[PDB]
């Protein structure tokens, strides 16, 4: 076949479904369901022609659904399959083929819902880093393209519920790999640290940290949901098993948090537990040590 552009012709809604009472409205919180307009004349394409949804920032879909059809009046025009960018790219793609269907004479049009979540960060990685850019607190554009052709939409996301002073903590599901990354960023000192002791485990066996994924870095601040947004070099010595990722660091400059990610497996990706190591010394002085586990049994 040819390759095809302009297939995709509208941004129609984009709305937010908090499928997992979410405190906060952030892009990267399950669902933004995508309304899209298409249409396909048969004096343009033809069967085994294809075309490509370009999609800046999505993550992933939130459901198991791989496929999505341009169907119209029952009848299916095209078949598109999704690919997410998760870790592996900045973007998503909707790679799409037109089906036997559209014959010379018909002339179609329809509407396509996609389950969105989108990539505002989360980990130490290169495709986080970068997308831990892509949008603001507030309003923004959402642009899709195909080929030439874009497709906007303004939508607003808010900042998150959690005072970033503290210490933090996310967790995310890669689809594709069955597994899960999980960040944790000591609490702030404002002006640097002298020393510290930060990472997480599970030493009951049925959660393995996988120490091939790992990031250690320092991040100067966060994004305005609390991911980091660069990762630099430090004073630290590190410790990973698949029971636990330990780091001790020193002499971090003010305006820097230190952070740690790894991927995980767990017998229940929607119902394990981590165990924290918080302790810490401000430049200054201000000394604290305060462990604690979390259960995690939502994840983005």
């Known amino acids: 076949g040819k390759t095809i552009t302009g297939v995709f012709n509208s941004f129609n809604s984009l709305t937010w479904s908090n499928a997992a009472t979410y405190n ?100 130490g990685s290169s495709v986080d880093l970068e997308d831990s850019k892509c949008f603001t607190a507030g309003t923004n554009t959402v642009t899709f393209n195909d080929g030439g052709k874009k497709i906007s939409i303004n939508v607003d996301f808010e900042r998150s519920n959690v005072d970033p002073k503290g210490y933090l903590t996310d967790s995310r599901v890669i689809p594709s790999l069955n597994k899960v990354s999980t960040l944790f960023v000591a609490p702030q000192c404002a002006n640097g640290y002298t020393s510290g002791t930060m990472g997480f485990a599970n030493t009951y066996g049925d959660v393995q940290i996988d120490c091939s994924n790992i990031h250690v870095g320092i991040t100067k601040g966060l994004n305005d949901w609390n991911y980091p947004v660069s990762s630099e070099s430090f004073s630290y010595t590190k410790t990973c098993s698949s029971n636990g990722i330990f780091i001790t660091y020193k002499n971090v400059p003010a305006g820097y948090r230190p952070f740690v990610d790894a991927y995980i497996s767990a017998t229940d990706v929607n119902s394990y537990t981590l165990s924290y190591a918080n302790e810490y010394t401000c430049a200054g002085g201000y000394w604290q040590r305060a462990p604690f586990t979390l259960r995690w049994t939502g994840y983005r």
């Open 24 to 123: 906060y409205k952030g892009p990267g919180t399950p669902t933004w369901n995508a309304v899209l307009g298409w249409s396909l004349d048969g004096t343009s394409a033809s069967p085994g022609d294809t075309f490509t949804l370009n999609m800046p920032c999505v993550f992933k879909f939130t459901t198991s659904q791989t496929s999505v059809d341009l169907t119209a009046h029952g009848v299916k025009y095209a078949t598109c399959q999704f690919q997410a960018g998760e870790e592996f790219m900045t973007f998503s793609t909707l790679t799409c083929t037109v089906s036997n269907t559209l014959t010379p004479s018909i002339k179609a049009l329809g509407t396509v819902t996609l389950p969105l979540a989108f990539n505002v960060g989360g980990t």
